[model samples]
Target: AQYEDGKQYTTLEKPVAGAPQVLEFFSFFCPHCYQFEEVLHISDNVKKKLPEGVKMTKYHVNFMGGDLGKDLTQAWAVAMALGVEDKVTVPLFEGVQKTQTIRSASDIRDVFINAGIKGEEYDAAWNSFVVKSLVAQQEKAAADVQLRGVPAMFVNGKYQLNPQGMDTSNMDVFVQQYADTVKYLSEK
Candidate 1:
């Protein structure tokens, strides 16, 4: 599918430049994405201990982008605009899983508001150049790659990663192994 650059979309653009990088394909509305949250956070910590070349970037998958899916996308976009994505990603995931409430742009606005961003500014940022660039980049990336689902990951743009793709069932273990794979592959 052709993607609209600088528009409303999500994909990984400029793949970590140099060195080995981990790309996390996630959807805020996806339960699996939520499940991977803690593990991802922990893995980030472990990643901090690794050498400089290794890195991780998250790509919010937007498969359903109409009503429900658009809402989640809006929320994610707003967070990226505000420069506080990490602060609300977990909470947004939890809200979706716990309440079964469909997240829309407004819902995300509330989340950001709670996190100390003003509603007006948040809205403005969502429609700003930075977010538009992000949308364009993401859309461009989607056009370049074929993805089956959210929560899918790519290591060095070579390996496919998923829960079952790991050696163990434990979340932490799986993530650590995945991280290790990223590190190992980057060197090759």
Candidate 2:
């Protein structure tokens, strides 16, 4: 249940300075990622409840795709550079859910453009080094963690889901537990 550090990282302007980072690794096409959105939307509560110096970053997991990886890479790259992540990420999630089609990079690009993001700035960020690093980090995470699927949560460099380690299928329950775990770890 430990995340291999030096892997699976996304760069974001820390919402809380000096806070321990909480990174959630997820795939854009995964339904679980969409489901977890509800709990994380309430993440502000979790942040407020933390002791301070605790920040959260969302890492886009790209284990499945031909061109899909490139799409996610571009999308996340834009988020990193523009600092308007919270603005577009949720919308992307919703778009995937509503469309049930995430096979094309252009489709994903359209999601960003539709979400009030200008095409040129979005394009520049998509090709930036930040996106390349994010994709690299995800590749390393998959290798380091030996992960088999999407929508996994890694908090403070630790995996929170273990089929044998924890017993529950209720996603909400699992997510709340994770938020609490993050808060506890940050304080410690």
Candidate 3:
């Protein structure tokens, strides 16, 4: 099926890049975003299908602050700074959703320690200027995207693939549909 902008997804007024860019606007505190993590890990199936020059970038959403959003956004930025995002992403999600243990930045530090990040590395990453800048950037990007919810996917910064519009029943089907939509749009 062809990707229909506005119906299937919304379009960005000023597109961000020359190459196709797929941005996932997600929040670690969101249960649905955590569920969407499964689709992300289906890399072998999804990655292989992405056309050349297509880049996938994840932007942590910080719309719902007060507790989870503020801390997890910082933690996510720290993980990205430490180059441990791939290592900590799922575990952090599970730590919060499955185990219900992680809540604050300190709890996230424990998760980092358990994931083999040394105290110094964690401290440096958690407090680094880079992390702070990234956190700000993520917040700005989230606002720029005009995000309404978690697990929102945008293609080439031009179209957002609305999950509600997806004609699928299961995660696998949804993943396939998303991948196909990405591939279709990337080719365009």
Candidate 4:
């Protein structure tokens, strides 16, 4: 649609070059995010519309749960690096927001341990340069958006969601609208 930038979404000061840098900003501590990840399956539905080879990155925001926020981000980074994101996302969300079992970094690691990842294996991914680099960029990305809140999204690394223009009357229509906008904006 080559939609009007400011009306639908404000352009990022520094957008990525070539291909889409679709990112979903979320935090395990957010109940809305939990619904998106669990009940809504927002990622799955959005990916269904995303172009082939275009990967979406889910950034664990560093704004919720205080210092534990960073710890949970680290936990997310670890899950991503180990290729076990789906394996631990549910428990992490439940522990942090629902059941309220996750309390600290150790508890964060315990989620991985309980997911069948050995403590040493978990440490390897947690401390590896790859995961370290991921976490560093993640924090910066979170800061870059100056987000209105969690459960935000950015497409083409530049176009951020504008609730004013989106139809959010219901989850089904909203997910379709969201994915359609992403598909529209994904092409520069």
lDDT of each: 0.61, 0.59, 0.75, 0.82
TM-score of 2: 0.70
Residue 185 CA error for candidate 1 (Å)? 1.7
Prediction-by-prediction clash tally: 2, 2, 0, 0
Candidate 1 vs candidate 2: the lDDT winner is: 1
Candidate 2 CA-lDDT value: 0.59
- Candidate 3 lDDT by residue in tens digits, 74-165: 88888877788887888888887789887677888898898899999889877889999989988877776677788777677677776678
- Residues 1-188 of candidate 2 have per-residue lDDT tens digits of 34222222222232223322555567667776666664444355446566656566666666655467557755776676687777777767766667555557777777778777899877877777877776676566555555567665444554343322332577556545555655655544
* Positional deviation of residue 125's Cα in model 4 after best superposition, in angstroms: 2.2
The residue ranges of model 1 lying beyond 4 angstroms of the native Cα positions read 1-20, 39-46
Instruction: Give candidate 1's error at residue 75 in angstroms.
Output: 2.9
lDDT of 4 at 36: 86
Ranking by lDDT: 4, 3, 1, 2
User: RMSD, each candidate, Å?
Assistant: 8.2, 7.1, 2.4, 2.3
Which candidate model has the greater lDDT, 2 or 3?
A: 3
lDDT of 4 by residue, 1-188 (tens): 44677756667787655523788889998878998889888888889998888988888887788899988888888888888998999999999888888998998898889989999999888888999898987887776767659888888767887656766678788777777778888865
